[PDB]
């Protein structure tokens, strides 16, 4: 029996996510077709012209694909499952220059070098300054009495995390943040005028200039670790550092932001959990917020050979799209997946991807950012209450909130 879905339904359709998360549709696939061919009409495949893709809705299947990276490739078609329908193939293939869209051994080399900037010591070194700025952001917002939670609470701390990691001077953080915000969302009418191509080029240019500068005058910031050769002589070229910075500007910006915004949305929806959070401040809340928020709705892979997955024959060359938003609510893995529970432990969500070679290198930096900001929100506006409904982002792979009006004072 075929799943009860509208004819021609596309789970990557940005017009859906601009309005809602298709929670009932995902649940229908998990019940009636956990692996399901999502057909795509000509010129409607978001930049891919192969007829469609396999929708992956179960967490165990998401994990299996992510582990078998020898079969399921990031490089072949990139991992983003939706661009503008008119994008040129060359604009998809330029993304193979960032680590996210590489396969081994190229990915293995880069990941080893970049891992020197995400050690627990390097990330933990950002704790104090990020805590300081989290407290300042919440106090500034609470003083305004009411406003846009997305812009006054959620936006700044993730960007300051990227800036602190890279050792960007305060005078430059303004344009760095601008370039980051110009990277994503070009399919929402509100951001129709942004040029991610142009920003990418400016970001790389800024980063290359920074790499050259930082070789002359090293410090402890991870940038020196990245461009300093090891015993094997392995290090990031200047253009490699540039493509890494472009990746950070995207990877750690709107992801953590939307986790913050949708975490607070859940707290407003579940006051018992908010009261529990304010009293205990449990750091397990961060993982439940990421599971609930699932900022990356979906990433794709391409099969390099025929592969049988959960009784379904995946053919060489076909795309599989891992819907993290479906897997993070998989009934077989979670007890009461649709209960927001900040104490859930263990919490094997795939908000940071499935375990494997590409697992989010910034997961713990993200968890620290989330924990610090919600401690500050609890410290400074414990009775904030929504004013109106959130405005969702028109995107086929990013689950974003553009605006959300809140009374930080309550009355
Ligand atoms: C709530 C926040 C975040 C979420 C939901 C998230 C999600 C993800 C996902 C789904 C992937 C792909 C994993 C896979 O394909 O198996 C990924 C990879 C990555 N993330 Fe994050 N991320 C977050 C925060 C961050 C931050 C703060 C940083 C850095 C400052 C970061 C840096 C990266 C990088 C560099 C990769 C590429 C790793 C690779 O391809 O080997 N992420 N992330
Ligand atoms: C400085 C290094 O980066 C670039 O030049 C650059 C960044 C970029 C981003 C997108 C894009 C794609 C999708 N959604 C947002 C942005 C597209 C093209 C991009 N290009 C150049 C493209 C050509 C590829 C090879 N032939 C000459 C140039
Ligand atoms: C060529 C320079 O690099 C890029 O253009 C680039 C880097 C990058 C990193 C992530 C990511 C996200 C989350 N966790 C890790 C990495 C996602 C997308 C990325 N893009 C493409 C931007 C496009 C903007 C328009 N809509 C389609 C996507
Ligand atoms: Cl986007």
Residue numbers in the entry: 18 to 428
Paper text:
Breakdown is then initiated with the conversion of the C‐3 hydroxyl group to a ketone (cholest‐4‐en‐3‐one, cholestenone) by the oxidase ChoD, and further oxidation at the C‐26 “tail” region via a three‐step process involving oxidation to the hydroxyl, aldehyde, and carboxylic acid species. These sidechain‐modifying reactions are catalysed by the cytochromes P450 CYP125A1 and CYP142A1 (CYP125 and CYP142 hereafter). Here we present a series of compounds based on an ethyl 5‐(pyridin‐4‐yl)‐1H‐indole‐2‐carboxylate pharmacophore which bind strongly to both Mtb cholesterol oxidases CYP125 and CYP142.
To overcome these issues, the cyclohexyl group was substituted with piperazine and morpholine rings, compounds 10–12, leading to enhanced solubility. In the cases of compounds 7, 8, 10, and 12 the ligand is observed at a greater distance from the heme, typically with the pyridine coordination mediated via a water molecule, to produce a reverse‐type I interaction similar to what was observed for the inhibitor LP10. This is likely attributable to the ability of the additional carbon to facilitate positioning of the ring closer to the plane of the indole, as opposed to compounds 7 and 8 which extend at an angle of 67° from this plane because of the geometric requirements of the single carbon linker. Later compounds such as 10, 12, and 19 have been optimized towards the observed pose of 7 and 8 in CYP125, with changes that gave improved solubility also allowing more favourable interactions with the more polar environment around Asn203, Glu204, the carboxyl oxygen of Arg99, and the N−H of Trp414.
